[PDB]
Design a protein around this ligand. Structure first.
Ligand SMILES: CC(=O)SCCNC(=O)CCNC(=O)[C@H](O)C(C)(C)COP(=O)(O)OP(=O)(O)OC[C@H]1O[C@@H](n2cnc3c(N)ncnc32)[C@H](O)[C@@H]1OP(=O)(O)O
Ligand SMILES: N[C@@H]1[C@@H](O)[C@@H](O[C@@H]2[C@@H](O)[C@H](O[C@H]3O[C@H](CO)[C@@H](O)[C@H](O)[C@H]3N)[C@@H](N)C[C@H]2N)O[C@H](CO)[C@H]1O
Ligand SMILES: [Ca+2]
Ligand SMILES: [Ca+2]
Length: 176
């Protein structure tokens, strides 16, 4: 059914810790953080100082994944140094359950996150940066309305820079 987003809290950290150690996640995210790693890195107030907002994806009253949005400009640590536009938001996300992968749930999560961010009238464009090897994530982002721009170097290595502008989001709301 319907994928929604709520803010992540401190109460979600043990669950997030478990998720980040599942093999389908460890593969693409990180790696293998301890409980204390997750607690000190993903505490919502700690993420705040990075301009990162954490969310839990919800489906039929159950938590099914983690997402984050961030302000690209001024990200620090070598991140997004050529950005000039404070309206740009980036996203990252994962699905908690291996049994639920490749069933279009990720596309729904991404669509829900993109709609959320464009409801901040200050947001001009959403970016994402899946690794070149992560073809499944790239295809998920494409189905969700993102377009591949090219390869950029990040502190996590080269990435496929993908974007969806507000104008593209407006134009793809109706077929009128
Ligand atoms: C910037 C970043 O966040 S980097 C990426 C982040 N996270 C991860 O990779 C964590 C582990 N993976 C996940 O949590 C999830 O797979 C997500 C969120 C990346 C994507 O969600 P999913 O539900 O699996 O994707 P969804 O099914 O909606 O779409 C994936 C597409 O790739 C295709 N696909 C499925 N498996 C693969 C694969 N192994 N290789 C290539 N393509 C694949 C699917 O068929 C679908 O395309 P199609 O509908 O045209 O046939
Ligand atoms: N100052 C930064 C802050 O801007 C922010 O950077 C963002 C990262 O989090 C994202 O990576 C995450 O998602 C990836 C999956 O998409 C995982 O492969 C990765 O393991 C995970 N970390 C990047 N894709 C985009 C960055 N802008 O968070 C950092 C540490 O948490 C801070 O140092
Ligand atoms: Ca505002
Ligand atoms: Ca239209």
């Amino acid at each position: 059914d319907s994928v929604t987003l709520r803010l992540m809290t401190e109460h979600d950290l043990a669950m997030l810790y478990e998720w980040l150690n599942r093999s389908h996640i460890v593969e693409w995210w990180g790696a293998r953080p301890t409980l204390a790693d997750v607690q000190e890195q993903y505490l919502p107030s700690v993420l705040a100082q990075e301009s990162v907002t954490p969310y839990i994806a919800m489906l039929n009253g159950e938590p099914i994944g983690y997402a984050q949005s961030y302000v690209a400009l001024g990200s620090g640590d070598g991140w997004w140094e050529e950005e000039t536009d404070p309206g740009v938001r980036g996203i990252d996300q994962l699905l908690a359950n291996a049994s639920q992968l490749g069933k279009g749930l990720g596309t729904k999560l991404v669509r829900a996150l993109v709609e959320l961010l464009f409801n901040d009238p200050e947001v001009t464009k959403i970016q994402t940066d899946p690794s070149p090897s992560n073809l499944r994530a790239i295809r998920c982002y494409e189905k969700a309305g993102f377009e591949r721009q090219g390869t950029v170097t990040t502190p996590d290595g080269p990435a496929v820079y993908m974007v969806q502008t507000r104008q593209a989001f407006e134009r793809t709301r109706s077929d009128a």
